[PDB]
């Protein structure tokens, strides 16, 4: 089946991914395209297999966080457009042009220098650019009518750059008060009809995320950027309760019990600090997962795992590579039983939203901090591979 | 200097690992050897280059968490003995013997079947084994003197195995109260005099971690296991106060500013949730690090970084790949300045132990969860190389 030295692993279900994409294609306008976002190692799911699969079932472009995340995808064989969403240093202009990665930019002075660099180095390829406008997120991008017009001018004079898009980003589209999201929208559509009254023609316009596409599908324009909804999770509990789109979660996490024993011999202290003392006939089972894997130390004396269809609790402090759980008085368990940490087993479930509520964070962070020393296995059409 | 597309990195100082080993060699009995623990990517510092340095300046053997972590070491040329501290499935018994890796064991059936596997293949390699004795931590190991003699007898009746050590683990050796450390020792020692009064010769014996080698060096026996002290960090505030040994921290985390602007136009909101609203002459700067890199979301509106030798605060919510900081009304700075996240700058310092207190955990978790998409650079004799 699954043969490992240290027995812990992840399963990603690609039949779920393809379903999530169908649901979204069917909600937004027929005219708009889809940009699959696979940065941070596919939100901790694996970037190569998910993008391969998303391009064959509805998406047409991809988005990452850095030039290095994009080069990984070109090396796997992918030929689609790749856009970089953060800031790229001028010292990577020649390399971005060589691998044909699309860059974000928003300053007059960055534009001219990236043009002279490619002018001296012979030429070869032209570097493609998307312009970022800041309408209220306050992170990256240009902020006035007058400033934007200067950038479009410096870009149109540049013979080695090529203009293929313009976008914005909503900071509160997952919240039930829609005031600030409509603010950003008017600011944006106004900036670009100013451009029009100058006789300037526009490329691809994108602005929606998962929450915007579900909640305001009339903002879809040319393209949307689908991220968290690709992996089967909702942006907020608010957006889930709307009940407009049904998604299925793709990831789960599993291990195998490594040792079982009865605590009838003194002393009966468990794990560091001796914060837990067992009873003479309690059964303690040891498991191969720790906080260096991403299972938070905050969960000691507090969390659950699923064994044989039931929740059993964590006993003592979490350690770097191992946790102990209590099977109770006279137990019932054997070396090699399968244990579910996130996901489903028989009747029961422990979901990623539940763990994130317990730790006062969001599902976004619970998945994308799963270590890479854990091996990932993919399910497609019922069968397993890697 | 450094040249990166996304501008964030780690520096590890090997001159400082060297001084740490010296300091520990001085304080323990000159008869005992040192085994260096590099499991979990070398507590987040990188396993390869730290192991090489250690083996060159005082260590004799290594410890890791699993057979996979040991194969990355042999692939870079390291020929020293390597012990696996966790449980290894019978699946990998033949693999362990080919790469010459040492495994822990404490069961009679596991020895029988491990010996069988290598018999049925002839096999010219004998697999080395260390026996784990549980005297008080109840994680793994054997518990009574009766059943440790069956395991000793079985291992001996095994022509394809080889005994090369016997060990235990102190569960509270970094606390003011010494009651339990005294007792585990008493038990472990009487299990050994029990054995010796049987005709049996004993191999290498070890029981000490960083904490117990500082406070109880009369426990050093044949060998110690140096883990956290190697990277320059104290197991507890109580062990540090005893002021018996001097340590120097080995790791820093830095980045470069990607954009800067004055918040003149409206709206002046910053980041997701609009939880921070700027002033019209306030300066706001953007950094390339986030919670998928390992910088906890819990530091939203609460953490600091060092710019030009001063503490600036995080502004608004932490996001997946970027943070935002405030420089004040008319603050000075430009695109490209250097900032320190963990470490020292001009006169100031933000220490790993301070960040750990903010989040109610320990320095072990902070360092060993820094992601692998962040590059590490090494400093030896005051200069650079990756
Ligand atoms: C600019 C941008 N667009 C789209 C996304 C995807 O966001 P979400 O996962 O909420 O759909 C992110 C993250 C982002 O930073
Ligand atoms: C059994 C064992 N020994 C030694 C170490 C190294 O511990 P420390 O850094 O506290 O010295 C660890 C961790 C461990 O689990
Ligand atoms: Cl942005
Ligand atoms: Cl142990």
JSON list of C-alpha atoms in Angstrom, two decimals, chain B residues 222-364:
[
{"chain": "B", "resi": 222, "resn": "UNK", "atom": "CA", "xyz": [30.40, 7.32, 28.07]},
{"chain": "B", "resi": 223, "resn": "UNK", "atom": "CA", "xyz": [28.78, 10.02, 25.88]},
{"chain": "B", "resi": 224, "resn": "UNK", "atom": "CA", "xyz": [26.35, 12.98, 25.79]},
{"chain": "B", "resi": 225, "resn": "UNK", "atom": "CA", "xyz": [23.73, 14.13, 23.25]},
{"chain": "B", "resi": 226, "resn": "UNK", "atom": "CA", "xyz": [24.13, 17.89, 22.56]},
{"chain": "B", "resi": 227, "resn": "UNK", "atom": "CA", "xyz": [21.10, 19.45, 20.85]},
{"chain": "B", "resi": 228, "resn": "UNK", "atom": "CA", "xyz": [19.90, 22.98, 21.58]},
{"chain": "B", "resi": 229, "resn": "UNK", "atom": "CA", "xyz": [23.15, 24.17, 23.19]},
{"chain": "B", "resi": 230, "resn": "UNK", "atom": "CA", "xyz": [24.94, 23.58, 19.86]},
{"chain": "B", "resi": 231, "resn": "UNK", "atom": "CA", "xyz": [22.99, 26.40, 18.11]},
{"chain": "B", "resi": 232, "resn": "UNK", "atom": "CA", "xyz": [23.62, 28.78, 20.99]},
{"chain": "B", "resi": 233, "resn": "UNK", "atom": "CA", "xyz": [20.35, 28.58, 22.92]},
{"chain": "B", "resi": 234, "resn": "UNK", "atom": "CA", "xyz": [19.63, 27.72, 26.56]},
{"chain": "B", "resi": 235, "resn": "UNK", "atom": "CA", "xyz": [17.11, 24.97, 27.41]},
{"chain": "B", "resi": 236, "resn": "UNK", "atom": "CA", "xyz": [15.50, 27.16, 30.09]},
{"chain": "B", "resi": 237, "resn": "UNK", "atom": "CA", "xyz": [15.88, 30.50, 31.84]},
{"chain": "B", "resi": 238, "resn": "UNK", "atom": "CA", "xyz": [16.81, 28.50, 34.94]},
{"chain": "B", "resi": 239, "resn": "UNK", "atom": "CA", "xyz": [19.77, 26.72, 33.28]},
{"chain": "B", "resi": 240, "resn": "UNK", "atom": "CA", "xyz": [20.94, 30.04, 31.86]},
{"chain": "B", "resi": 241, "resn": "UNK", "atom": "CA", "xyz": [20.90, 31.72, 35.29]},
{"chain": "B", "resi": 242, "resn": "UNK", "atom": "CA", "xyz": [23.16, 29.08, 36.91]},
{"chain": "B", "resi": 243, "resn": "UNK", "atom": "CA", "xyz": [25.84, 30.81, 34.79]},
{"chain": "B", "resi": 244, "resn": "UNK", "atom": "CA", "xyz": [27.99, 27.70, 34.39]},
{"chain": "B", "resi": 245, "resn": "UNK", "atom": "CA", "xyz": [28.68, 27.91, 30.61]},
{"chain": "B", "resi": 246, "resn": "UNK", "atom": "CA", "xyz": [28.74, 30.63, 27.93]},
{"chain": "B", "resi": 247, "resn": "UNK", "atom": "CA", "xyz": [26.75, 30.29, 24.66]},
{"chain": "B", "resi": 248, "resn": "UNK", "atom": "CA", "xyz": [26.52, 32.43, 21.51]},
{"chain": "B", "resi": 249, "resn": "UNK", "atom": "CA", "xyz": [23.45, 32.52, 19.20]},
{"chain": "B", "resi": 250, "resn": "UNK", "atom": "CA", "xyz": [24.05, 31.28, 15.65]},
{"chain": "B", "resi": 251, "resn": "UNK", "atom": "CA", "xyz": [21.12, 32.52, 13.49]},
{"chain": "B", "resi": 252, "resn": "UNK", "atom": "CA", "xyz": [19.70, 35.76, 12.02]},
{"chain": "B", "resi": 253, "resn": "UNK", "atom": "CA", "xyz": [16.79, 36.57, 9.66]},
{"chain": "B", "resi": 254, "resn": "UNK", "atom": "CA", "xyz": [16.86, 39.64, 7.36]},
{"chain": "B", "resi": 255, "resn": "UNK", "atom": "CA", "xyz": [15.16, 41.22, 4.34]},
{"chain": "B", "resi": 256, "resn": "UNK", "atom": "CA", "xyz": [15.14, 44.35, 2.12]},
{"chain": "B", "resi": 257, "resn": "UNK", "atom": "CA", "xyz": [12.37, 46.99, 1.70]},
{"chain": "B", "resi": 258, "resn": "UNK", "atom": "CA", "xyz": [10.33, 46.61, -1.48]},
{"chain": "B", "resi": 259, "resn": "UNK", "atom": "CA", "xyz": [8.25, 49.83, -1.58]},
{"chain": "B", "resi": 260, "resn": "UNK", "atom": "CA", "xyz": [7.69, 53.02, 0.41]},
{"chain": "B", "resi": 261, "resn": "UNK", "atom": "CA", "xyz": [4.94, 55.68, 0.20]},
{"chain": "B", "resi": 262, "resn": "UNK", "atom": "CA", "xyz": [3.27, 58.58, 2.04]},
{"chain": "B", "resi": 263, "resn": "UNK", "atom": "CA", "xyz": [-0.44, 58.06, 2.70]},
{"chain": "B", "resi": 264, "resn": "UNK", "atom": "CA", "xyz": [-1.73, 61.25, 1.05]},
{"chain": "B", "resi": 265, "resn": "UNK", "atom": "CA", "xyz": [-4.79, 60.10, -0.93]},
{"chain": "B", "resi": 266, "resn": "UNK", "atom": "CA", "xyz": [-7.85, 58.43, 0.65]},
{"chain": "B", "resi": 267, "resn": "UNK", "atom": "CA", "xyz": [-8.69, 55.81, 1.77]},
{"chain": "B", "resi": 268, "resn": "UNK", "atom": "CA", "xyz": [-5.73, 55.35, 4.15]},
{"chain": "B", "resi": 269, "resn": "UNK", "atom": "CA", "xyz": [-6.56, 51.80, 5.31]},
{"chain": "B", "resi": 270, "resn": "UNK", "atom": "CA", "xyz": [-3.76, 49.19, 5.53]},
{"chain": "B", "resi": 271, "resn": "UNK", "atom": "CA", "xyz": [-4.07, 45.42, 4.82]},
{"chain": "B", "resi": 272, "resn": "UNK", "atom": "CA", "xyz": [-6.86, 42.83, 5.17]},
{"chain": "B", "resi": 273, "resn": "UNK", "atom": "CA", "xyz": [-9.72, 43.68, 7.50]},
{"chain": "B", "resi": 274, "resn": "UNK", "atom": "CA", "xyz": [-8.91, 47.40, 7.42]},
{"chain": "B", "resi": 275, "resn": "UNK", "atom": "CA", "xyz": [-7.63, 47.06, 11.05]},
{"chain": "B", "resi": 276, "resn": "UNK", "atom": "CA", "xyz": [-5.19, 49.99, 10.81]},
{"chain": "B", "resi": 277, "resn": "UNK", "atom": "CA", "xyz": [-5.82, 53.47, 9.37]},
{"chain": "B", "resi": 278, "resn": "UNK", "atom": "CA", "xyz": [-2.83, 55.69, 8.60]},
{"chain": "B", "resi": 279, "resn": "UNK", "atom": "CA", "xyz": [-2.27, 59.46, 8.91]},
{"chain": "B", "resi": 280, "resn": "UNK", "atom": "CA", "xyz": [-1.81, 61.72, 5.85]},
{"chain": "B", "resi": 281, "resn": "UNK", "atom": "CA", "xyz": [1.95, 62.26, 6.35]},
{"chain": "B", "resi": 282, "resn": "UNK", "atom": "CA", "xyz": [2.66, 58.79, 7.78]},
{"chain": "B", "resi": 283, "resn": "UNK", "atom": "CA", "xyz": [5.19, 56.67, 5.88]},
{"chain": "B", "resi": 284, "resn": "UNK", "atom": "CA", "xyz": [4.33, 53.01, 5.20]},
{"chain": "B", "resi": 285, "resn": "UNK", "atom": "CA", "xyz": [6.84, 50.36, 4.05]},
{"chain": "B", "resi": 286, "resn": "UNK", "atom": "CA", "xyz": [6.36, 46.84, 2.68]},
{"chain": "B", "resi": 287, "resn": "UNK", "atom": "CA", "xyz": [8.51, 43.74, 3.40]},
{"chain": "B", "resi": 288, "resn": "UNK", "atom": "CA", "xyz": [8.67, 40.29, 1.62]},
{"chain": "B", "resi": 289, "resn": "UNK", "atom": "CA", "xyz": [7.94, 37.89, 4.50]},
{"chain": "B", "resi": 290, "resn": "UNK", "atom": "CA", "xyz": [4.74, 36.32, 5.85]},
{"chain": "B", "resi": 291, "resn": "UNK", "atom": "CA", "xyz": [3.07, 33.49, 7.75]},
{"chain": "B", "resi": 292, "resn": "UNK", "atom": "CA", "xyz": [3.75, 30.87, 5.10]},
{"chain": "B", "resi": 293, "resn": "UNK", "atom": "CA", "xyz": [7.46, 31.58, 5.72]},
{"chain": "B", "resi": 294, "resn": "UNK", "atom": "CA", "xyz": [6.93, 30.91, 9.44]},
{"chain": "B", "resi": 295, "resn": "UNK", "atom": "CA", "xyz": [6.33, 34.43, 10.78]},
{"chain": "B", "resi": 296, "resn": "UNK", "atom": "CA", "xyz": [3.22, 33.83, 12.86]},
{"chain": "B", "resi": 297, "resn": "UNK", "atom": "CA", "xyz": [-0.05, 35.59, 12.06]},
{"chain": "B", "resi": 298, "resn": "UNK", "atom": "CA", "xyz": [-0.39, 36.11, 15.86]},
{"chain": "B", "resi": 299, "resn": "UNK", "atom": "CA", "xyz": [2.06, 39.00, 15.50]},
{"chain": "B", "resi": 300, "resn": "UNK", "atom": "CA", "xyz": [-0.54, 41.13, 13.69]},
{"chain": "B", "resi": 301, "resn": "UNK", "atom": "CA", "xyz": [-0.47, 44.65, 15.21]},
{"chain": "B", "resi": 302, "resn": "UNK", "atom": "CA", "xyz": [2.03, 43.39, 17.82]},
{"chain": "B", "resi": 303, "resn": "UNK", "atom": "CA", "xyz": [5.55, 42.57, 16.57]},
{"chain": "B", "resi": 304, "resn": "UNK", "atom": "CA", "xyz": [8.58, 44.66, 15.65]},
{"chain": "B", "resi": 305, "resn": "UNK", "atom": "CA", "xyz": [11.55, 44.71, 13.27]},
{"chain": "B", "resi": 306, "resn": "UNK", "atom": "CA", "xyz": [14.80, 46.74, 13.15]},
{"chain": "B", "resi": 307, "resn": "UNK", "atom": "CA", "xyz": [15.31, 49.56, 10.61]},
{"chain": "B", "resi": 308, "resn": "UNK", "atom": "CA", "xyz": [18.37, 51.81, 10.90]},
{"chain": "B", "resi": 309, "resn": "UNK", "atom": "CA", "xyz": [18.87, 50.56, 14.46]},
{"chain": "B", "resi": 310, "resn": "UNK", "atom": "CA", "xyz": [15.31, 51.21, 15.71]},
{"chain": "B", "resi": 311, "resn": "UNK", "atom": "CA", "xyz": [12.20, 49.15, 16.50]},
{"chain": "B", "resi": 312, "resn": "UNK", "atom": "CA", "xyz": [9.31, 49.76, 14.07]},
{"chain": "B", "resi": 313, "resn": "UNK", "atom": "CA", "xyz": [5.87, 48.09, 14.52]},
{"chain": "B", "resi": 314, "resn": "UNK", "atom": "CA", "xyz": [3.96, 45.74, 12.25]},
{"chain": "B", "resi": 315, "resn": "UNK", "atom": "CA", "xyz": [0.95, 47.65, 10.84]},
{"chain": "B", "resi": 316, "resn": "UNK", "atom": "CA", "xyz": [-2.25, 45.72, 10.32]},
{"chain": "B", "resi": 317, "resn": "UNK", "atom": "CA", "xyz": [-2.66, 42.03, 9.66]},
{"chain": "B", "resi": 318, "resn": "UNK", "atom": "CA", "xyz": [0.17, 39.71, 8.60]},
{"chain": "B", "resi": 319, "resn": "UNK", "atom": "CA", "xyz": [-0.47, 38.15, 5.14]},
{"chain": "B", "resi": 320, "resn": "UNK", "atom": "CA", "xyz": [0.75, 35.04, 3.34]},
{"chain": "B", "resi": 321, "resn": "UNK", "atom": "CA", "xyz": [3.85, 36.59, 1.70]},
{"chain": "B", "resi": 322, "resn": "UNK", "atom": "CA", "xyz": [4.28, 40.16, 3.02]},
{"chain": "B", "resi": 323, "resn": "UNK", "atom": "CA", "xyz": [4.09, 42.43, 6.06]},
{"chain": "B", "resi": 324, "resn": "UNK", "atom": "CA", "xyz": [3.65, 46.22, 6.32]},
{"chain": "B", "resi": 325, "resn": "UNK", "atom": "CA", "xyz": [5.42, 48.45, 8.87]},
{"chain": "B", "resi": 326, "resn": "UNK", "atom": "CA", "xyz": [5.01, 52.09, 9.88]},
{"chain": "B", "resi": 327, "resn": "UNK", "atom": "CA", "xyz": [7.83, 54.65, 9.93]},
{"chain": "B", "resi": 328, "resn": "UNK", "atom": "CA", "xyz": [5.84, 57.56, 11.36]},
{"chain": "B", "resi": 329, "resn": "UNK", "atom": "CA", "xyz": [4.84, 61.01, 10.08]},
{"chain": "B", "resi": 330, "resn": "UNK", "atom": "CA", "xyz": [7.60, 61.93, 7.60]},
{"chain": "B", "resi": 331, "resn": "UNK", "atom": "CA", "xyz": [9.81, 58.91, 8.34]},
{"chain": "B", "resi": 332, "resn": "UNK", "atom": "CA", "xyz": [13.13, 58.41, 6.59]},
{"chain": "B", "resi": 333, "resn": "UNK", "atom": "CA", "xyz": [13.88, 55.39, 4.40]},
{"chain": "B", "resi": 334, "resn": "UNK", "atom": "CA", "xyz": [14.04, 54.21, 0.82]},
{"chain": "B", "resi": 335, "resn": "UNK", "atom": "CA", "xyz": [13.38, 51.20, -1.42]},
{"chain": "B", "resi": 336, "resn": "UNK", "atom": "CA", "xyz": [16.23, 48.76, -0.76]},
{"chain": "B", "resi": 337, "resn": "UNK", "atom": "CA", "xyz": [17.16, 49.41, 2.88]},
{"chain": "B", "resi": 338, "resn": "UNK", "atom": "CA", "xyz": [18.07, 46.38, 5.03]},
{"chain": "B", "resi": 339, "resn": "UNK", "atom": "CA", "xyz": [15.90, 45.27, 7.97]},
{"chain": "B", "resi": 340, "resn": "UNK", "atom": "CA", "xyz": [16.51, 42.68, 10.75]},
{"chain": "B", "resi": 341, "resn": "UNK", "atom": "CA", "xyz": [13.70, 40.39, 11.97]},
{"chain": "B", "resi": 342, "resn": "UNK", "atom": "CA", "xyz": [15.55, 38.05, 14.36]},
{"chain": "B", "resi": 343, "resn": "UNK", "atom": "CA", "xyz": [18.95, 39.24, 15.56]},
{"chain": "B", "resi": 344, "resn": "UNK", "atom": "CA", "xyz": [21.12, 42.34, 16.05]},
{"chain": "B", "resi": 345, "resn": "UNK", "atom": "CA", "xyz": [21.41, 45.70, 14.28]},
{"chain": "B", "resi": 346, "resn": "UNK", "atom": "CA", "xyz": [23.51, 48.71, 15.29]},
{"chain": "B", "resi": 347, "resn": "UNK", "atom": "CA", "xyz": [22.83, 48.89, 19.01]},
{"chain": "B", "resi": 348, "resn": "UNK", "atom": "CA", "xyz": [19.57, 46.89, 19.14]},
{"chain": "B", "resi": 349, "resn": "UNK", "atom": "CA", "xyz": [18.56, 43.22, 19.35]},
{"chain": "B", "resi": 350, "resn": "UNK", "atom": "CA", "xyz": [15.36, 41.19, 18.93]},
{"chain": "B", "resi": 351, "resn": "UNK", "atom": "CA", "xyz": [16.11, 37.72, 20.29]},
{"chain": "B", "resi": 352, "resn": "UNK", "atom": "CA", "xyz": [14.46, 34.40, 19.48]},
{"chain": "B", "resi": 353, "resn": "UNK", "atom": "CA", "xyz": [13.67, 34.07, 23.18]},
{"chain": "B", "resi": 354, "resn": "UNK", "atom": "CA", "xyz": [11.73, 37.34, 23.26]},
{"chain": "B", "resi": 355, "resn": "UNK", "atom": "CA", "xyz": [9.62, 36.34, 20.25]},
{"chain": "B", "resi": 356, "resn": "UNK", "atom": "CA", "xyz": [9.04, 32.97, 21.89]},
{"chain": "B", "resi": 357, "resn": "UNK", "atom": "CA", "xyz": [7.68, 34.62, 25.06]},
{"chain": "B", "resi": 358, "resn": "UNK", "atom": "CA", "xyz": [5.28, 36.82, 23.02]},
{"chain": "B", "resi": 359, "resn": "UNK", "atom": "CA", "xyz": [3.66, 33.64, 21.62]},
{"chain": "B", "resi": 360, "resn": "UNK", "atom": "CA", "xyz": [3.73, 31.45, 24.76]},
{"chain": "B", "resi": 361, "resn": "UNK", "atom": "CA", "xyz": [6.05, 28.78, 23.39]},
{"chain": "B", "resi": 362, "resn": "UNK", "atom": "CA", "xyz": [9.77, 27.92, 23.48]},
{"chain": "B", "resi": 363, "resn": "UNK", "atom": "CA", "xyz": [12.76, 28.81, 21.29]},
{"chain": "B", "resi": 364, "resn": "UNK", "atom": "CA", "xyz": [12.77, 25.23, 19.87]}
]
